Amino acid sequence: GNPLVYLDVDANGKPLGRVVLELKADVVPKTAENFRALCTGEKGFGYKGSTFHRVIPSFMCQAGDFTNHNGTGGKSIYGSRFPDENFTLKHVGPGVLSMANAGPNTNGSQFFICTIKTDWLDGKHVVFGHVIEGMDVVKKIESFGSKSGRTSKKIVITDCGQLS
Numbered sequence: 001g002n003p004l005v006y007l008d009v010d011a012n013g014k015p016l017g018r019v020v021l022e023l024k025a026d027v028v029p030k031t032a033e034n035f036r037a038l039c040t041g042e043k044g045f046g047y048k049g050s051t052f053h054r055v056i057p058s059f060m061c062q063a064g065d066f067t068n069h070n071g072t073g074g075k076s077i078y079g080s081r082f083p084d085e086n087f088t089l090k091h092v093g094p095g096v097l098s099m100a101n102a103g104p105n106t107n108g109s110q111f112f113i114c115t116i117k118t119d120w121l122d123g124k125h126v127v128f129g130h131v132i133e134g135m136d137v138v139k140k141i142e143s144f145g146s147k148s149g150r151t152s153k154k155i156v157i158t159d160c161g162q163l164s
């Protein structure tokens with residue numbers, strides 16, 4: 001079946017807990033596979049040790065820039081960037097996992113977890129999974145953001161990987 005993966009997240013060096021994500025490989029296999037492999041680190045790089053660098057309350061929590069840690073970087077397991085696979089899944093509500101980008105066909109490693117329905121992103125960002133467990137952790141992360149996206153605590157993915 002679809003992969004289940006996890007992010008264990010600290011805020012200011014203390015654990016918040018675990019976010020478990022289902023990756024919809026049935027719908028977006030290329031996009032799911034990228035994220036899965038970046039969680040395991042099996043290609044020699046990935047999310048371990050990287051941060052949630054941009055967090056906006058009542059919108060989303062963004063992470064995955066493991067090269068520049070500021071929203072300008074990251075890379076996929078395929079090369080620096082890869083195409084939008086499809087827009088079949090929609091940003092339906094809190095818990096949606098979706099690819100950040102810099103315009104059409106610029107997926108890399110950055111992603112975000114929505115804390116509200118973000119319908120205006122439909123057809124622009126590739127949705128590829130959702131939170132199975134750990135929305136409490138997501139809400140904590142969310143509570144450390146700001147209108148500008150600047151975080152008030154250092155939010156680190158200390159560990160990550162594949163469950164199934």
Ligand SMILES: Nc1cccc(-c2noc(CCl)n2)c1
Nearest residue numbers: 072100101102106107108110
């Ligand atoms: N994948 C992704 C998501 C958000 C921003 C970016 C991005 N911004 O600047 C650059 C320099 Cl190449 N990349 C890339």
